[PDB]
Paper text:
Omega transaminases (ω-TAs) can mediate the chiral amination of several unnatural substrates without the requirement of an α-COOH group and are highly relevant in the production of several pharmaceutical intermediates of commercial interest. In this work, we successfully overexpressed and characterized the two recombinant transaminases TA_2799 and TA_5182 from P. putida KT2440 and solved their crystal structures. The overall structural fold of the TA_5182 and TA_2799 enzymes is similar to that observed for other class III fold type I TAs with two α/β domains. There are two highly flexible loops present in the structures of TA_2799 and TA_5182 that mediate the entry and exit of the cofactor and the substrate/byproduct into the active site of the enzyme, leading to significant conformational changes in the enzyme structure.
The crystal structure of TA_2799 was determined at a resolution of 1.76 Å in the PLP-bound holo form. The PLP-bound state of TA_2799 is similar to most of the structures found in the PDB, which is the catalytically competent state of the enzyme. Continuous high-quality electron density could be seen for the covalently bound internal aldimine form of the PLP bound to the catalytic K286 residue in both the subunits. The PLP molecule is linked to the ε-NH2 group of the catalytic K286 via a covalent Schiff base, and the pyrimidine ring of the cofactor molecule is sandwiched between the Y150 and I259 residues. The protonated pyrimidine nitrogen is stabilized by hydrogen bonded interactions with D257, and the hydroxyl group of the ring forms a water mediated hydrogen bond with E224. The phosphate group of PLP is stabilized by an intricate hydrogen bonding network, either directly or via water molecules, to S118, S285, Y150, and T323ʹ similar to the “phosphate group binding cup (PGBC)” described by Denesyuk et al.. On the other hand, the L322 position in TA_2799 is usually occupied by an aromatic amino acid. In TA_2799, the side chain of L322 is not bulky enough to cause this change, and as a result, the phosphate group of PLP may not be as tightly coordinated when the PLP molecule is bound to the enzyme. In TA_2799, C324 occupies the same position. C324 is not adequate to cover the crater, so the crater in the crystal structure of TA_2799 is filled with solvent molecules instead.
Author numbering:
A (entry chain A): 5 to 459
B (entry chain B): 3 to 459
Write the structure that this text describes.
């Protein structure tokens, strides 16, 4: 059987229209090279999304392969239960502690960001039980947030299509307004005034619920999967100021913004966030190995230790927690990012990247352009004057996603917002190639949107 | 002075399933190198890994063919996702291979990284399918005391081991836990195993009728309870449980994350006990843990409802970044190929009688209350009084000693409170078995002296 035939017979795809899949079948990706991937027939595509916002070092970094191979040949697997450990997992924990801001000094490993955020929920409940605060358990998130796919993590997620028919949220979570200035600012309202309203919304909820029942706020510094939405001016100062006055932990999900994506090593630096807990994945390993990390404070670790003293063990763990090959790849991935000063590279490249995005502001299909560092979004709308969404949201974005392949370009459509998140290794020439292909794609999409009567 | 690894670990690493307070005092044991069924620490001490790590390293700790499979895939495509119709050859081939191996019409496969994610995915799929069918009340899960199904919030709610719930506010989804099917512990005086099975089936049916079958979506269970104490089911259990579930249209979810790929002497434990699952979950031996991978295999009927939902909702809005990871799935494919090529299921069938006899040699030992096991899994439960089956005053005190002391005799086992578990790699030889139990004999002698001096008896 062909790969296509194996796929159509047996594979349930994630985040895919499974009915349309029976008709159109899969696109088989066969090979990676730098910022490009190739399908089974040999067609080339510039991967302007780094896959899933994650392949920081591109798709053929032999030094990551080498790190995996070297570890495989010594010890291809061992666990970290019952005091057992391995050298890469311990070295990576120490490295993440050295990189993370403030007293974020203690690291717990998982396979995925979803597991990591599940672990945060469990750790926070555990610590507040240990502290004699058994009521202090509710989480606060936001509309359009993305924090993962497990039952708890997807309850923190605030994208409504990810809740529909899954009975989510299934744990106590409140979702604030999405901090999207373009979409929700009032006529003539400044970004600062929008932030005032968002911060007051958060505090109004805390006071109505009772702060003694609220354990934590979780958020991405920039909302990615929900639409590439940078925060409005002053937002993170205001949110932290509120949370600090109620002993509400600030959990910062850096699974996409971490490791240079915004032009600083962690997005928390750019926005002046001091997290109580920081969550990392994706560019942590360039997704060459499944790995995520939860980084917590000395104070939180001390409570975890006092719990083991009275309960006998920290009764939480995954079979591959601390996997020696996964953590060895991450350690090498970080070393490359530092040795090659890729954070500095993003700083150098971000202006031309952002300029290319904003060149489309006057385009007939474009309602808003936004972006920070090496992440960007171009939101297409049915009417520029009224910011009107399309009658069936995603109709035009879905076309752009498909049609870009014909021009050798992979982007990701978030309904009708076109996302860009290319590898940290992207060059000036790569940027020009991305936008040449996107120009051709958007010209096709203009003909298509007009014929389809979408505008 | 401590090694750099020890210093790094003590400064920064939060350990899973570890006493974090004791860890500050005793520090970590650094495992450095693998060699077949053995591992070596940083000091050069050697250990026969009688647990395959975490019940999982089926091919042992130095199988170069799995390394080769990872390398060959790394050189072509080190990562790509499976969202938005994208796919890769190893994930598609592995899906087809698992569908070919799985019983009945378990023909459709969803990939995750971990068993916990997989069981979380099962919970979501079951709720999704029941909403799709216009049955919004049919959502409750049934599990069992001492079950283990993972560590995420939902999966750990299905887990029935109380220490894994304590201070975590679990269960946190609707679940009911039946009696643990442990004949040694819960049989009445003179009761046969078949009679105990009847009582367990009637317990399940009474619960269903009292709750309302229209509110109950699924039963989940391991064929043999592993992390909960190596507890095989009593005679006829699975036939009886399945019949009740079928009577009330309750899905049967079989968690083969440990029993899968030959552990019990059949490719899947469902064959040994005559289980036909609606959903089967796989991990661990799937890759010998060389790569994080798990799989959910569902029936045609389940898949048809998932497809009808995408028709009306636009997408199956569920997925992990590394779902279907090409390196992880390529390693799993080669792992299965080696199991088949070397007929390791047949090898387990040959080893199992010898292994089980070595376990039962300890039945008459003064510390041993019960010996149990099937295939290449076994457990030796230590008790304070054999006549009354009395647990120890502080459960785990003796088991913890045995765990520590076995290292001194070159042996790694796992203590489940005071039950000693054995689950060696599929590649274990008869010589290896003799070495395991020679070292365990010496450890149990040490423990008998220690238990006496400690006044535990």
């Amino acid at each position: 059987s062909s790969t296509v035939q194996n796929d159509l017979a047996a594979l349930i795809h994630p985040n895919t229209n499974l009915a349309q899949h029976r008709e159109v079948g899969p696109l088989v990706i066969a090979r990676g090279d730098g910022v490009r991937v190739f399908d089974e027939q040999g067609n080339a595509y510039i991967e302007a999304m780094s896959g899933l916002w994650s392949a920081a070092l591109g798709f053929s970094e032999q030094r990551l392969v080498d790190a995996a191979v070297e570890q495989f040949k010594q010890l291809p697997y061992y666990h970290s239960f019952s005091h057992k450990t391995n050298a890469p997992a311990a070295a990576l924990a120490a490295k993440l502690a050295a990189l993370a801001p403030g007293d974020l000094n203690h690291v717990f490993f998982t396979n995925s960001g979803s597991e990591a955020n599940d672990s945060v929920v469990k750790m926070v409940w555990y610590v507040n039980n240990a502290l004699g605060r058994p009521a202090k358990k509710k989480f606060i998130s936001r509309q359009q947030a993305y924090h993962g796919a497990t039952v708890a993590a997807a309850s923190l997620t605030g994208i409504p299509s990810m809740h529909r028919d899954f009975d989510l949220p299934a744990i106590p979570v409140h979702h604030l307004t999405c901090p999207n200035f373009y979409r929700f600012a009032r006529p003539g309202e400044s970004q600062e005034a929008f932030t005032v309203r968002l911060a007051n919304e958060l505090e109004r909820y805390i006071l109505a619920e009772g702060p003694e029942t609220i354990a934590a706020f979780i958020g991405e510094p920039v909302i990615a999967a929900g639409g590439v939405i940078p925060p409005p001016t002053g937002y993170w100062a205001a949110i932290q100021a509120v949370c600090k006055r109620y002993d509400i932990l600030v959990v910062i999900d850096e699974i996409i913004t971490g490791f240079g994506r915004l032009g600083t090593m962690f997005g928390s630096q750019l926005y002046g966030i001091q997290p109580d807990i920081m969550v990392l994945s994706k560019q942590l390993t360039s997704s060459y190995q499944p790995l995520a990390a939860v980084v917590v404070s000395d104070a939180m670790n001390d409570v975890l230790v006092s719990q083991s003293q009275r309960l006998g063990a920290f009764a939480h763990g995954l079979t591959c927690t601390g996997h020696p090959v996964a953590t060895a790849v991450a350690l090498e991935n970080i070393r490359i990012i530092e040795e090659r000063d890729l954070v500095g590279h993003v700083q150098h490249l971000a202006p031309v990247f952002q300029r290319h995005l904003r060149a489309f502001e006057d385009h007939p299909l474009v309602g808003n352009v936004r972006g920070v560092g090496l992440m960007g979004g171009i939101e297409l709308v049915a009417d520029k004057a009224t910011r009107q969404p399309f009658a069936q949201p995603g109709t035009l974005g879905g076309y752009v996603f498909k049609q870009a392949h014909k021009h050798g370009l992979i982007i990701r459509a978030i309904y009708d917002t076109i996302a860009f998140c290319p590898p940290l290794i992207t060059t000036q020439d790569d940027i020009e190639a991305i936008f040449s292909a996107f120009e051709r794609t958007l010209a096709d999409a203009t003909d298509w949107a007009r014929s389809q009567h979408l505008l």
